[PDB]
């Protein structure tokens, strides 16, 4: 049981020596078209590539390339579009690929700024009567209502597909109170977040895969879907025991790389997950 493997870790502080297992056993795959010129201005970070096996294409005959990847969980049966925080540049693109992939939700786990520097682009408009117009994919954006709590903010934003006069609501799920530095003291927020979305049916197989994004898309982003997934399993199963985390995070892994980008996000996930559990058993 996990509970009790993470007493041993933590008594061990073997945390950054399981990361480090992790990190070493991850899956490596091309990301060839990530790495093509014409495409280094569409991503945030050069080091942070979309393999080429499980990413997101966008339906425009020009250039197809977004950094985003489809994390397929066919045991639990969910999906997950994991991304970058828009650029200046790429929100039109971002948007484009909600609508085409019919998402429901939208899950941003960062703040516009952190630590003095932009972490991603205003993608969303911020009055209802001030709506965006991305001119490049024929799109428009309303924010249609906004309910402000302590810890995040959900947004509810219409998007109207120019081209078709077709509408559609999308959720914004915005987790607002994640620390510039390591990891939110408490699960408790967090899991909380979590349940509205679920909550929401933005998870749900009835809509496309719910978008996720941080500023790189791998290391809070990353602790969403692993928490998520995990436990999900657990009811599944109904069985807190034959779910391995770190197995769970191998498999995400083959989908985006470097998913938990410090081993206080992996300690962090192992808490919710343990804490969520209570709540589901
Ligand atoms: C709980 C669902 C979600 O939050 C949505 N919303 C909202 O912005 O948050 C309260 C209003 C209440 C139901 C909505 O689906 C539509 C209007």
Redesign the pocket.
């Known amino acids: 049981e996990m509970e009790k493997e993470f007493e041993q870790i933590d008594k061990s502080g073997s945390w950054a020596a399981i990361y480090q297992d992790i990190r070493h056993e991850a899956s490596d795959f091309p990301s060839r078209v990530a790495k093509l010129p014409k495409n280094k201005n569409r991503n945030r970070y050069r080091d942070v590539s979309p393999f080429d096996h499980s990413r997101i294409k966008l339906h425009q005959e020009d250039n197809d390339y977004i950094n985003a990847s489809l994390i397929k969980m066919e045991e639990a049966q969910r999906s997950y579009i994991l991304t970058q925080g828009p650029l200046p540049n790429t929100v039109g693109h971002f948007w484009e690929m909600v609508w085409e992939q019919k998402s429901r939700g939208v899950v941003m786990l960062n703040r516009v700024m952190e630590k003095g520097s932009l972490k991603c682009a205003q993608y969303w408009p911020q009055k209802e009567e001030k709506e965006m117009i991305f001119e490049d994919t024929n799109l428009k954006l309303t924010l249609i ?1 906004e ?1 402000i709590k302590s810890y995040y903010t ?3 934003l219409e998007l109207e597909n120019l081209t078709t006069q077709e509408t559609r609501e999308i ?1 914004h799920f915005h987790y607002t109170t994640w620390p510039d530095f390591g990891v939110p003291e408490s699960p408790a927020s967090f899991l909380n977040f979590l349940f509205k979305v679920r ?2 049916g933005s998870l749900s197989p009835e809509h496309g895969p719910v978008v996720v994004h941080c500023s790189a898309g791998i290391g809070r982003s990353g602790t969403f879907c692993l928490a998520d997934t995990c436990l999900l399993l657990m009811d599944k199963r109904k069985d807190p025991s034959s779910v391995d985390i770190k197995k769970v995070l191998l498999e995400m892994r083959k989908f985006r790389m470097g998913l938990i980008q410090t081993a206080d996000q992996l300690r962090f996930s192992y808490l919710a997950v343990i804490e969520g559990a209570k709540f589901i058993m």
Do not use: G, Y
Request: aromatic share 0%.
């Open positions: 209502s309910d959900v947004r509810q959720l909550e929401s």
